[PDB]
Amino acid sequence: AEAMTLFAVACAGLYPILHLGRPWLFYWLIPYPNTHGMWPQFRSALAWDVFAISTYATVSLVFWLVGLIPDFATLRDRAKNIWVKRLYGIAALGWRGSARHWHRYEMASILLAGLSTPLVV
Amino acid sequence: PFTPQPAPVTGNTYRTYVNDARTLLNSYGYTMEGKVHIPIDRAMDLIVERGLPVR
Amino acid sequence: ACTYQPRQYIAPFDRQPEGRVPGIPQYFASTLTLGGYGTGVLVRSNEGRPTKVEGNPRHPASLGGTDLFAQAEILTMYDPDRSTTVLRQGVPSTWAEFTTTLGNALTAARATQGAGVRLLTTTITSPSLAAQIEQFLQAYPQARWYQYEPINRDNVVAGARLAFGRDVTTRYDLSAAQVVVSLDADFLAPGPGFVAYARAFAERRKVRKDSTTMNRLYVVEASPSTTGTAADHRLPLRADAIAAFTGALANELGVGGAPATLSPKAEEFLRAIARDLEEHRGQSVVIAGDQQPPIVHALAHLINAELGNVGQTVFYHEPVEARPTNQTEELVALVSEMAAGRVETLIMIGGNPVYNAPGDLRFADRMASVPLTIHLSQFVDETSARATWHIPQAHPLESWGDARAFDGTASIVQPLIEPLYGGKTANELLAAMLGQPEAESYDLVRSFWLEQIGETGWQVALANGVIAETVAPVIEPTLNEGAIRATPIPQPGDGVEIVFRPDPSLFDGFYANNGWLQELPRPLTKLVWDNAALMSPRTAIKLLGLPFNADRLIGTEADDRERQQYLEQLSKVNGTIARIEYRGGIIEIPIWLLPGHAEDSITLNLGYGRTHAGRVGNNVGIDVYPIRTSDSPWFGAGARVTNTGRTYLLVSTQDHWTLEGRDIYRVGEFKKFKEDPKYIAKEVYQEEYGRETPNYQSLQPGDDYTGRNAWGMTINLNACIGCNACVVACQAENNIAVVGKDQVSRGREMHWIRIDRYFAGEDLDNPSIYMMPVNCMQCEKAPCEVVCPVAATVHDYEGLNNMVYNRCVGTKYCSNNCPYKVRRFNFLQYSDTTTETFKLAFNPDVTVRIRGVMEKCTYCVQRISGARIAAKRAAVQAGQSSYVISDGAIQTACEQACPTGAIVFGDINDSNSRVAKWKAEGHNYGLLGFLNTVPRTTYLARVRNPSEELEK
Amino acid sequence: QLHVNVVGIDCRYCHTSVDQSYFANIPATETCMTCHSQIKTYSPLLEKVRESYATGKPIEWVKVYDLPNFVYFNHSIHVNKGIGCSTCHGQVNNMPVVWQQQALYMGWCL
Amino acid sequence: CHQDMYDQQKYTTYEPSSFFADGRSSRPNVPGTTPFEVVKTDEFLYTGLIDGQEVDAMPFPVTKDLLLRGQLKYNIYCAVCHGEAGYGASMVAERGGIVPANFHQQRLREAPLSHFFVVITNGVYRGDPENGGYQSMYGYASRITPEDRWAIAAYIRALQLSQN
């Protein structure tokens, strides 16, 4: 399901650029230091929309990767081949599934879910 | 690209001509072939006083 | 790839112009002719190039106002399809070769007396050209002039000869006319003296609090027009029955005429016309249209004389048309001489005879009989392609010359640039035929106008826009009762009739290459890029066999919305092709539904179907000139409609012809308006809320605008006639692009101002027409600004709505939140880039928009910025630090173009300004007030002055 | 540098339209020939100037101060309100070759 | 990296054009064409000749502001190359051998005012049809307004008085 969210957000993230008519200027909706001194309005809903999709995509990606870390460890433990290893190994960050690590993992996952619920809403 | 620094101008300039002429245009004086000088911004008051032929 | 911008070279002069300050536009006084009659124009040259045309306040017939053709002459001059070289037989040739051939051909004519030599010009009013033609006729006695143009005034001069026994010019002073009656007279349309008549009429209709009188307009027309819109009472009579209507009107007033069997509605209309007349003697005028037969003109002169209007509202002058004549009869005589083979040389000066001549004359076939054909067309027109020795003609904006307006004024046509592709004028050719080749157009008009008004008079004439010495003298002709009484007075019949009318935007078809006019939505029809057969819904139902009752459109107020829904369902039959058989011709033109049309009458618009026009309009519309006949050029007898199925796509800019019971257009009566000017606003609000005042409350503070300038605009509905002059002025001033017919079909027209007609009332087959101009309302709390994420649309210190093109990313959200939908988007690349002449027509003070940005009305900000800068500079140069702007200092393009003066722009805070006084009226209101937008562009409710005999 | 600091020509002798319009006039070849018809005549450095004025061809100078055409600058209002060329174009009187003193950003105007 | 409306299809003041022959979008003046409400009736306002000869008079009376404007236009256009105080001593005459005229000589002291006007307008003398010839004063018709030309002539008279 979360994989479907990341892919659906990736597909939905093209229409705000494609429908623009001047697509290459999409970064003008982002508060960036410019030679002009112009800001986004922030009173329109498209400025909220830019901040919302960016936060939604980044938080869903880091939450998905946090959930994938133990599975990365189980894959690099069963990868058999040496070069299939070291690929999931750096993805698992050398998980070494142990106590004093599962505690912080469960609490961070609880906080992440409690934060992502009002995010998607 | 630092700001360029042009070479200083050579000695000969127009400044000495303009300073001498504007100093001549004031402080009265006596010319070579004539009688007396009149400072500028004062002969103009004489012109508007005596006037010029019109029409 | 680098350096942000290229090199961008700059090329200055080698010798500076004496009186030009670089970067400062200048204005020159010239003259633009429509149907041979001149109109003084003030044209702007930026750096030696014409860019904008406006009215000449010093010239009669253009008191600060212009028509759509005078505005579009800018783009007509910059057409990339204008002729550039002399063509002997389609072959590029030279001017010296043509001069030698003309001199050799005229030497052969010198052996005769010019019997083979024939001319063919249009309606000539230029004194210089008329004097040179007369001199050429004295040199060649057997030569003939023969002037003709498709939109002429043959019926007017024929009626003047029938009534007075001589040629006279009839002028109408509507400023002292309390009752005006039009007998198929579209005097509020571009024609002779259109701007002056429309201005006087509007200033008589502009009602205020202190106002006490208001004029009334009666019109009787076959096809509705702009004049019928401003009419308090409109009668949709057939085109043939108008002569009998005039006879019955003359008979009822006690004057010699003939009674006619008419409908009860026409009888009640005759009753009211006769009753309002005779009670306003010397305060009335009866106007006969040029389309109506000569007897109608003569009866109108008789009615006006008996009523005492002559000398008060109707004035008679000496003829101002040089030679007044029946042009169609002279064209028949010329084609008869060509068919007999008597002519040996035929010189034509414009007019496009091959395309404009009636179909029964066969001008193209007889044109082969004359060996030498010569034409000046300013384009490679159809006639020039089938002729030898085509000579490019200089545009009126690049040539020396003169012209005469209605009532006679003799203004000078001053050039603004040397001819781009070369090209000679008419008097230069006439001098060439007078044994004077390589003659300069400057010296010709200067030699004629000298020794008559003097050198100081020529200098004063060039300075202003008029010549003070030339004016048609006032004469008093005598009326012949026996001749106008003993006249057949034809009766209607023979079945379905065809009414030939000039196209509102294309005229005789000359402007078919102009993109601005071809794209301009036609009034009352809203069609673009096409031509259609206009007919009433009942006529289409009965003739094409369409499955509709046409009686369901009749009803009361209780079922108005249901009738509007049925009219929407009935509008789905637009586009059905009809095979109209008139007199041996089949036209096969698509149909269109025009509710106000008279039954059993079909209106066909001229000026379409050209084959040798420019890239724009090269194959648009269906040509109606072949079915046009010499015996009757404006009316028809019997026709066969023959519906064929086989639909054709017709394109409209509105697609909805009825306001769905909303507070868009406000109408009242003058009798109730006098007692209380606020009564219209007190209504509606009672039916919507139960109280007389809508206590609208807002949650936003807005801005103050107390001690600062506040720009506002007011549109008077009592003066708008739908002439569409403000749209072409906005296009010419603001570099608005021109999209194709395909892009308009998808609803992507780019126009900052639009006029909407709403066909409302009972019957919906005889509906009152309501024209309303709409642009950016400039809402103080603009909802289009709180939605654009890049802040490209913000508000100004002066209350203006700033739309910045270089910031728009193109979210298209700024348009969805606009309640009035006055924002246009560049969905594709619409602005021209390759054509050099179109690049020369752009106004340098306005950026040309690229693909992906939004546009809307900016109150012509370039003129506001120029006046503000000039005011600040004048304040600091005097040491005042005041910065104060005059009232009339700023004038938007739509304000200057409007000949009626319906648009007023100025400062809101300055109480003595004209806008502040107009906005204080009781009938001043703003559209869609329930949305707390606080618009700065307001409307003045329409007030009517109907007769008690017709209303009760 | 030669024409302002040495010869001593005023700026309005050449850019005559600066205090009246939005555009500072670029000198026509007539202003150059007013002096170089007798000064340094028959010299290679003035060949282009002498080729013009005889033929209607202009001199294609390169714009140093460039604007993206949607900016609309006005020299007249700035000069009449007490703003000098030193604060904008720098010390042009001492430039043998003219350079852009600083980039024409929007924040610079602001 | 953008270049959208940076360079536009419209033709600015001096933007070069490939549609015209001489490569210029700006156009020269039409010979006999005058602007709106600008009448060329008065001859003294536009030429120093009343009958083909000079007059030693001025079309409008002299004003202090008029003399100040003449001094300004003289210092801008006339002072360089021809003398700041009117003696003909300038940096221009040093390089080129211009030898400009001296206003304080007796020939130009008895010269009429309209002679000064026609000299500013046209020049000193064009090339003779025979034995060569060249223009020296070269004229200043396009750069100076006729009223400013009369103000310059009035300031020349004031300079001639200030040196007497």
Ligand code: HEC
């Ligand atoms: C019109 C914009 C021009 C152009 C294109 C040039 N000038 Fe001048 N100039 C003047 C004087 C007194 C000199 C120096 C004389 C000397 O060195 O003997 C110059 C010099 C030049 C040069 C260099 C010539 C060289 O080095 O040999 C060039 C390329 C040049 N100029 C171009 C005087 C004036 C003057 C006031 C009388 C005006 C106005 C101009 N010049 C204008 C122009």
Ligand code: HEC
């Ligand atoms: C008084 C010190 C000034 C100032 C402030 C400027 N000018 Fe000149 N100008 C002249 C010519 C022939 C050119 C084009 C050639 C070139 O740019 O090298 C210019 C150009 C400029 C610019 C830059 C133009 C641009 O497009 O960026 C500027 C900023 C400028 N000028 C200001 C001619 C003369 C001249 C003799 C005819 C005199 C004297 C001056 N200029 C003086 C000044």
Ligand code: HEC
């Ligand atoms: C250098 C380009 C000059 C400028 C700047 C001005 N003038 Fe001049 N002028 C110049 C020369 C080389 C001469 C002498 C010509 C000759 O053949 O000897 C002149 C002449 C005059 C005269 C005398 C006219 C006569 O017929 O004798 C006058 C009155 C005069 N010039 C006035 C004048 C004014 C008003 C100027 C500013 C517009 C000005 N001069 C500038 C060269 C140059």
Ligand code: HEC
């Ligand atoms: C910052 C205010 C400002 C001042 C004051 C100003 N300039 Fe400009 N100048 C500019 C800008 C900005 C441009 C670029 C114009 C453009 O790109 O269209 C420019 C361009 C020019 C040009 C090129 C031609 C043109 O019209 O663009 C000239 C010449 C010039 N300046 C000279 C002058 C002179 C002479 C003065 C008189 C003191 C002056 N400047 C004062 C800012 C200024």
Ligand code: SF4
């Ligand atoms: S507002 Fe526009 S359409 Fe209406 S009368 Fe004026 S110019 Fe014509």
Ligand code: SF4
């Ligand atoms: S009329 Fe439309 S575009 Fe104009 S200010 Fe109002 S909402 Fe914005």
Ligand code: SF4
């Ligand atoms: S005010 Fe200017 S921009 Fe607005 S509609 Fe009128 S002409 Fe067009």
Ligand code: F3S
């Ligand atoms: S939403 Fe804004 S980005 Fe443009 S399309 Fe409207 S001004």
